[PDB]
Design a protein around this ligand. Structure first.
Ligand SMILES: C[S@@+](CC[C@H](N)C(=O)[O-])C[C@H]1O[C@@H](n2cnc3c(N)ncnc32)[C@H](O)[C@@H]1O
Ligand code: SF4
Ligand code: SF4
Ligand code: SF4
Length: 425
């Protein structure tokens, strides 16, 4: 009798953290409860119940015992947990990323005008065996989910094996695809997968506009969504808000409903100078007005569709706004504590935005992900950045924002004083 496989437990500098690996609801734990549950994980609830005897009689474990997180040398493990919690404190960082992002291949078969990762160099793409080692560290270190991107990942030669490794390691994984040339075998590995969920890149059902945006008709993305619904497999649609009208968005919502799409995400359009070709039409305010339009539509028709907008600093469109020790590191720029991205050559980046930063990056094929997660200059830089902008210093969201996206700030003359134009508050 231990902790459920559907529950993610990790020791943190403030105790511990529990998260459902399917519901995504989370609970912050004491140091007592975290040490308690750590034993309950590495030993039985009995061996754990032995320790903390006084605490259980003091009522200090009334909550931790009142949870539904259970399923079917403790001195040295309790000591090592203490050695761990102390190290996290002396670094003041999250234990491990909750999100790992991997780019097994930068090659893609398309050249979407809105994309910033097209035509990239894809020379010596490592095989799934090498990524398997990386995946094992992530699993063993407490990662919550592994997102497979690119590039078109389905055009990655060893994609089938890589997907198998994620299924065998039982890591909550997603793969995002244009669905153009996806192999039959691959579609099967996804159809009979319990842990992997496909995401389909689809800008619209309108053939012309989608062809202008991606350079293909939406036919194959539509076909695959329809197919997964047949074999009863969870599927998702991801679109970038670039040129779509409201009417075209709603048309795409209805498609998700009819075909029972798990989640429909509309990402904010991020311009990257020198790479993105299309001009940005809508800001974050326009994205909020859209979100409040779609949710008002999905509910005004009684649909169980899981809708969302995505991007950084989306909160800057809400002027209507004390964070917990975890929330301070969870909300806002994920590149600080909750995210890691691994390039095709093994380059480790806090964020994909660091592709254009000409600083040195460590290799995930030579070094360990946890070492880098502790001692890496790029992480230290973004983590330790503090803005001196007057508006920001008096802003309620300073702790999670720090004057905007760090990667943009360090490009400016006086980054500590420059506020990101995305915020006009
Ligand atoms: C990293 S991309 C590439 C992976 C894969 N080739 C695909 O198209 O799904 C994953 C998602 O990012 C989205 N995307 C691409 N460029 C973007 C941008 N400039 N801003 C926001 N989202 C973007 C795409 O729609 C895609 O669904
Ligand atoms: S968005 Fe995906 S399909 Fe389009 S070029 Fe970028 S990487 Fe390829
Ligand atoms: S940029 Fe400044 S004012 Fe705007 S959300 Fe971030 S800290 Fe607050
Ligand atoms: S570094 Fe910038 S682009 Fe990357 S998550 Fe942080 S805010 Fe977003």
């Amino acid at each position: 009798r231990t902790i459920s496989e559907d529950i993610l437990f990790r020791l943190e500098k403030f105790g511990g953290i529990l998260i459902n690996k399917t519901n995504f609801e989370r609970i912050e734990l004491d140091e007592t409860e975290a040490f308690f549950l750590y034993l309950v994980q590495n030993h039985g609830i009995e061996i754990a119940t032995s320790f903390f005897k006084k605490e259980i009689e003091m009522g200090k474990l009334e909550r931790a015992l009142s949870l539904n997180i259970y399923s079917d040398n403790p001195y040295e493990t309790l000591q090592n947990a203490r050695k761990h919690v102390a190290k996290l404190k002396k670094h003041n960082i999250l234990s491990f990323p909750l999100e790992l992002v991997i780019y097994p291949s930068m090659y893609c078969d398309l050249k979407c005008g809105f994309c910033f990762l097209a035509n990239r160099e894809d020379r010596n793409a490592k095989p799934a065996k090498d990524w398997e080692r990386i995946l094992r560290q992530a699993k063993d270190n407490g990662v919550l989910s592994v997102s497979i991107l690119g590039g078109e990942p389905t055009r990655y030669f060893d994609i089938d094996n890589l997907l198998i490794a994620c299924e065998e390691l039982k890591i909550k994984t997603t793969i995002t695809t244009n669905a153009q040339l996806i192999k039959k075998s691959t579609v099967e590995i996804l159809a009979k997968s319990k842990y992997i969920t496909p995401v389909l890149s689809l800008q619209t059902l309108d053939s012309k506009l989608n062809f202008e945006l991606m350079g293909v008709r939406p036919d194959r993305q539509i076909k695959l969504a329809k197919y997964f619904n047949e074999v009863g497999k969870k599927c998702r649609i991801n679109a970038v808000y670039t040129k779509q009208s409201y009417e075209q968005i709603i048309e795409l919502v209805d498609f998700c409903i009819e075909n029972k799409i798990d989640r429909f995400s509309v990402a904010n359009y991020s311009e990257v100078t020198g790479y993105t070709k299309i001009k940005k039409k809508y800001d974050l305010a326009d994205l909020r007005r859209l979100n409040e339009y779609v949710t008002d539509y999905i509910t005004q028709r009684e649909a169980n569709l899981n809708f969302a907008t995505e991007g950084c600093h989306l909160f800057t469109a809400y002027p209507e706004l004390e964070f917990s020790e975890f929330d301070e590191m969870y909300y806002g720029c994920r590149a600080k504590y909750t995210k890691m991205e691994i390039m095709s050559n093994g380059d480790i980046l806090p964020c994909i935005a660091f592709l254009g930063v000409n600083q040195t990056k460590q290799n995930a094929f030579e070094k360990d992900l946890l070492d880098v997660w502790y001692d890496d200059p790029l992480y230290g830089g973004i983590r330790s950045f503090r803005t001196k902008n007057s508006k920001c210093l008096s802003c309620g969201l300073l702790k999670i924002c720090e004057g905007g996206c760090y990667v943009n700030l360090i490009k400016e003359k006086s980054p500590e004083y420059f506020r990101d134009s995305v915020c006009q508050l």
